[PDB]
Ligand binder design. Structure first.
Ligand SMILES: [Ag+]
Ligand SMILES: [Ag+]
Ligand SMILES: [Ag+]
Ligand SMILES: [Ag+]
Ligand code: NI
Ligand code: NI
Ligand code: NI
Ligand code: NI
Ligand SMILES: [O-]
Ligand SMILES: [O-]
Lengths: 570, 122, 100, 570, 100, 100
């Protein structure tokens, strides 16, 4: 017997060669392969296959190759591929990607993906499944920002802050041992993974290092604390010793050096360049040239993403508000004009498309939007397809190459840069089960369900008083993963090796999973998946035009975006 | 008596900043092609290499401008600025690493400045 | 509907604006939160209509005048900021000194 | 170079001799002195002074005189003064009031107020900073009452209750060892300081005392439990032994004695007289005469504050509702008329102004408003300036004398009365960093940010999904200080010495900071800052007119108040 | 706007009152929560208008009559209480037996 | 009023529907959450009016047509479900494919 491809896709999700539109963009992803055995698909429900003696094994205890959770029929979109598989989870980790069910009676069952008495089922047929997003530019300013992040599919927040204190409102910095300890305890109640950055500033080692020993997971150099040659150098010396990442927002004012001076202080050491385009901060006007170097892991923040007709008017004024600039101070006007530049924002779109900026991130509540990292990544990919066409590397009319390049910017690459990709950042066996289900119509806009350590943490779901959960109002809501003590088992606090060795978690009574930051010092641009391009970026000091390989990079701003007014109530 | 909630009625007079400290006027030129903006409290001798001025005259000093403001130098721009004396212990550490100690060590500061190419060391 | 947290919150602004407009329609001079609600909701509905950031920066300065509000209210409001979904995505609008 | 006073005040907040209007009242406070060195003001931001090597020290580790938090340029309003200073916080305590920055390069830096790598910055220029309010008349009836209190700048709640049980709905009483234990555990989740009062009733010592050993921080004598001579005497004997405060709501009905009988049972012992005016409860009609005695620490509750055209109509009916009075029972009508009296409410305004009632408090959810203690203190001060003129003691047209007298009523005096002023109640070195920032336009109406143990607990802040935190809707919200385990480190549970010595915190698993109640028995009226007046208060039994020094105290009710319709949506 | 917790809550009452008035306008006899919402919002808007507590104690008894509400509703409502900001600050209004 | 949790939540739907109807009245093609809000509130007010489940299953398919909504919105909405209190208690209404 045969099933036509339309009915097949409707019942089990798409299979090899089928394409799916991402939300209301022009972007199409194509199923590259499928782990199933046709006819033995797993599914759960009345009269379905995952039943005792049938697709569910009735013999094996949990320890014997049986899963805690099976996601059936997922369309995975990941830097490792776009393909169809069941996903098996056990002890909060992805243990099997392949084909789940019962080897009693089914062909092709992955040996450790048995559905048994211990197995919960989530139906992913017709959904796209990605890794949870990793946002490495977070200011901890308002706890309400966490659900905002979860609702757009972000599962890890790396950054700094103590709430709406001015230091935190400008910089991703939790400064010193006591603030770091206080925020580690606060983190106990935040239903998302967290890593905390200390203040990357000082001219002696000890005041900086003690933050790492206290529990920081990295450092932030910020111009507002003095992004001087000395602060840059000491932070990097601390980081090379402690094996943690350093983020930088460089000296916009060029006060103590120009871009080449900052690069000289970095001296070939590994560093994460934040909002590398520079509207968000950095050496005026040429900071974006950072993204060409082999030792720089470059990220954008999200409000310049992508370049639109409102962008410049919005940003000139945003900068005036943020900096308290006055229009009758010519130096303030010159400053704003040297900082907000259509030439570099237009080129930023293209550098993303070329794999020269490796990462996205939000800049949540300081100069960026907590719930729009994923949203704006896809809007950029869509604009670039419209203006530059399908990339050379593409085939069969699909956008798979661009999709992997772009999904990498907010999943695997920030994890690699931060030294946490052994735990999070991709759908691979042996990594933590942070998973986001998306209806394709809502892809990148509003997550269906967010799984944190193998338990749903957040879901778009309806009336809790109803007979079924789908009646209105359907809204984003915290789920059982966030409640009680389960918040501890479903989330990770990332910390430096030295704070872990020194017993800071026991000292502070932290009950969350503790993740180890590591392997951050021996990586470079070459390690950014699908975004590994190094090149001489020239930024003209007079006109601000951006050149790469002798060619000016420019594109037009668009009047309209997908993933916008079709979806949002405000 | 229109009421502006929380308004100030400031007293008469003016506030003199950095009162009693020696002031010095010097000329400074941005020889670079990108703008440089310098804050009120950076040790003046340690500013961007491409600012050309008598470097000796910046030692132990900073801009005599209200706390938290800045002097701006457009590319190619030369202008005069007024400096005031550093206070407290008169020691500077870090920044561009030219001092890391007492500001009295003028030769050592100038020697470091000259070797690293801070413009204007005599 | 799939309301996200901001969608839920910003419904409140619209509601407060409706409340304020009723109070104005019956002849009351508006107070501080009323005035803010009115201009805020104006900006957000302007974005929904497809106006530009630039247009709303101008218009927001003429939604209410000093004779619409209580004594002191004009001076209490330095600016009003709102983010909303334009045809080209979320953007920030700030209306400076909305009420002279 | 010189800066004109207008620009100076706009950039750094006001300085010596400048005045600031409190909200939309007629009240002006004047900067009495300023700890700064002109030209070395600390400020944080792009290109500002608190940067490494400059205003921020880059050498010192946290232990070496470096702060966890600096509030820059605060205008302090406190019983100790109205003046300008930076405020330094470390380990959750105020450690330095003076001048913060870097002694490398700045003159006049207070030696333990170094801004270093460990230092967070809150900009207080242009804000007024006060101690958090101490509300000593709280009924614990509805947990929603906590944010209400925080939003009007209250940081400590002393009182009693088990939720909306009738006992708790009428009386500030958590009765007996088990209820007290249960509420101590409940307190673990309340983001505000708490002290719990037991039932000050019994004719044997042990049933009363066991509440103190169980963890109560004081006692409440309430007529609804029998405010008899015996209950009064036993409670005071218990309190003199345990070193805790006793609050009293006396026998309104004069059932077992008149005012002189209650005073005889008190027998010169120290006692806190609640709602001393008497609308809130007490010997009819003359309870307010309590406020003249040297052993009485007198407080008002807030709904009579201040006397307005709606007050009497509102209160007659409020009393009818609260007491379930019937208009066709002449005894109920006589009762209400003997209890709600314009003569004593008008005099109450004046007694506050004269420093004869020492304290405010709310009576939250039983007969008073959780979020209006601070609000109504200033409305009273403003009405008294309008009707009585600037006080004799004032100078230079400022209202500093009245401002210190009034700010004392809800900060330092309730702390002193409760035996907790070693920890809270004022901005002084060595006290817990409970601090409220106010924009002057909102002063006393809606707090900007509430700092609890050195971390922001509550803030008026905007859209959590926005690029910056100021866009609408700006509303009061719990901050990171309230989240996770940080709620334990930022808040104090006040308890009796005996319960502390007996290990009740470990017995119950309390993780909050434990504060010790002490020095409550050896104080009197003379110990109330700026409100220390003792005098013969005469209350005419026939006309209810109040005399002090031969002079009738009366004023008119006002039709309108500041801090009212300009501010509130409802 | 600087909404405090009560401001946020009481917006709900206004909204419920708007909902109830629409239901009444289309000819429905109102139920218990509808009736309460209507009278409550009346009191709060009365305070915003600057009426006195005494005025609203009288008026609140004539906002709805028994023929506006379902059978039993008059008897279910013993009183309706609301606090709102008058020109002289927050005061409590109780309307006793609002619907005969 | 004694609002239970569902009563509190469902006030939001009515509010979102009022917002959407204003946007439609000024000539905007409605988006996904607007369209859902409008039909949902229709169902709930229909139940309050005493219509039957069967009636609302029919009517809900004619509240909005494709020319009222943005491109793609009809196809995004497979059904709209709502529970409300009918004269015979809470019942579930599902309107299938509300917008062709
Ligand atoms: Ag800024
Ligand atoms: Ag900014
Ligand atoms: Ag009563
Ligand atoms: Ag009462
Ligand atoms: Ni930045
Ligand atoms: Ni940032
Ligand atoms: Ni009482
Ligand atoms: Ni009471
Ligand atoms: O940033
Ligand atoms: O009371």
């Amino acid at each position: 017997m045969k099933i036509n491809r339309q009915q097949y896709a409707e019942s089990y999700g798409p299979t090899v060669g089928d394409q799916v539109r991402l939300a209301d963009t022009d972007l199409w992803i194509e199923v590259e392969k499928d782990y199933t055995t046709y006819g033995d698909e797993a599914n759960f429900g009345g009269g379905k296959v995952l039943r005792e003696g049938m697709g569910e094994n009735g013999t094996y205890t949990r320890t014997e190759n049986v899963l805690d959770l099976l996601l059936t029929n997922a369309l995975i979109l990941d830097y490792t591929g776009i393909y169809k598989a069941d996903i098996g989870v056990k002890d909060g980790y992805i243990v099997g990607i392949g084909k789940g069910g019962n080897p009693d009676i089914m062909d092709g069952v992955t040996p450790n993906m048995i559905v048994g008495t211990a197995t919960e089922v989530i139906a992913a047929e017709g959904k796209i499944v990605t890794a949870g997003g990793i946002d490495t530019h977070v200011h901890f300013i308002n706890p309400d920002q966490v659900d905002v992040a979860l609702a757009n599919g972000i599962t890890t927040l790396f950054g700094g802050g103590t709430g709406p204190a001015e230091g935190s409102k400008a910089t991703t910095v939790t400064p010193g041992p006591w603030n770091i300890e206080k925020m580690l305890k606060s983190t106990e109640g935040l239903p998302i993974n967290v890593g905390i950055l200390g203040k990357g500033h000082g001219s002696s080692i000890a005041p900086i290092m003690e933050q790492i020993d206290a529990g920081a997971a990295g450092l932030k150099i910020h111009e507002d604390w003095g992004a001087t040659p000395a602060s840059i150098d000491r932070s990097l010396t601390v980081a090379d010793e402690a094996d943690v990442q350093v983020a930088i927002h460089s000296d916009t004012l060029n006060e103590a050096g120009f871009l080449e001076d900052t690069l000289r202080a970095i001296n070939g050491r590994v560093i994460h360049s934040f909002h590398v385009e520079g509207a968000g901060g950095g050496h005026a006007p040429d900071i974006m040239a950072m993204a060409g170097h082999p030792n720089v892991l470059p990220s954008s923040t999200n409000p310049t993403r992508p370049f639109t007709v409102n962008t410049i008017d919005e940003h000139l004024d945003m900068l005036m508000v943020c900096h308290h600039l006055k229009q009758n101070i010519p130096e303030d006007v010159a400053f704003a004009d040297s900082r907000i530049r259509p030439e570099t924002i237009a080129a930023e779109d293209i550098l993303h498309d070329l794999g020269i900026i490796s990462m996205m991130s939000t800049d949540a509540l300081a100069m960026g939007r907590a719930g729009e990292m994923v949203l704006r990544t896809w809007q950029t990919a869509d604009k670039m397809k419209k203006q530059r066409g399908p990339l050379a590397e593409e085939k069969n009319g699909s956008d798979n190459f661009r999709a992997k390049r772009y999904v990498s910017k907010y999943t695997i690459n920030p994890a690699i840069a931060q030294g946490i990709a052994h735990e999070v950042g991709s759908i691979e066996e042996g990594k933590f089960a942070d998973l986001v289900l998306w209806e394709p119509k809502f892809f990148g806009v509003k997550a269906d369900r967010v799984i944190k350590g193998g338990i749903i943490a957040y879901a778009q779901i309806g009336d809790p008083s109803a007979s079924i959960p789908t009646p209105q109002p359907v809204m984003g809501r915290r789920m059982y993963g966030t409640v009680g003590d389960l918040i501890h088992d479903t989330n990770i606090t990332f910390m430096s090796k030295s704070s872990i060795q020194q017993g800071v978690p026991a000292k502070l009574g932290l009950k969350r999973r503790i993740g180890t930051v590591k392997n951050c010092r021996n990586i470079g641009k070459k390690d950014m998946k699908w975004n590994d391009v190094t090149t001489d970026i020239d930024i003209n000091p007079e006109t601000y035009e951006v050149k790469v390989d002798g060619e000016v990079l420019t594109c037009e701003p668009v009047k309209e975006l997908p993933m916008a007014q079709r979806y949002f109530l405000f | 008596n229109y009421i502006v909630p929380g308004e100030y009625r400031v007293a008469e007079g003016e506030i003199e900043i950095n009162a009693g400290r020696e002031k010095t006027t010097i000329r400074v030129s941005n020889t670079g092609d990108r703008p440089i903006q310098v804050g009120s409290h950076i040790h003046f001798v340690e500013v961007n290499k491409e600012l050309l001025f008598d470097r000796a005259e910046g030692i132990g000093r900073r801009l005599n401008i209200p706390s938290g403001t800045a002097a701006r130098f457009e590319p190619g721009e030369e202008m005069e600025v007024e400096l005031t004396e550093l206070g407290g212990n008169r020691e500077v550490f870090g920044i561009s690493d030219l001092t890391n100690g007492s500001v009295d060590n003028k030769e050592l500061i100038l020697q470091r400045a000259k070797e690293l190419g801070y413009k204007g060391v005599e | 509907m799939h309301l996200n947290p901001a969608e839920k919150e910003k419904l409140q602004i619209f509601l407060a604006s409706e409340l304020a407009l009723k109070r104005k329609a019956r002849g009351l001079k508006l107070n501080y939160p009323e005035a803010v609600a009115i201009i805020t909701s104006f900006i957000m509905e302007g974005a929904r209509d497809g106006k530009t950031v630039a247009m709303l920066m101008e218009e927001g300065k003429h939604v209410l005048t000093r004779d619409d509000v209580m004594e002191g209210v004009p001076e209490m409001i330095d600016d009003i900021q709102a983010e909303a979904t334009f045809p080209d995505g979320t953007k920030l609008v700030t209306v400076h000194n909305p009420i002279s």
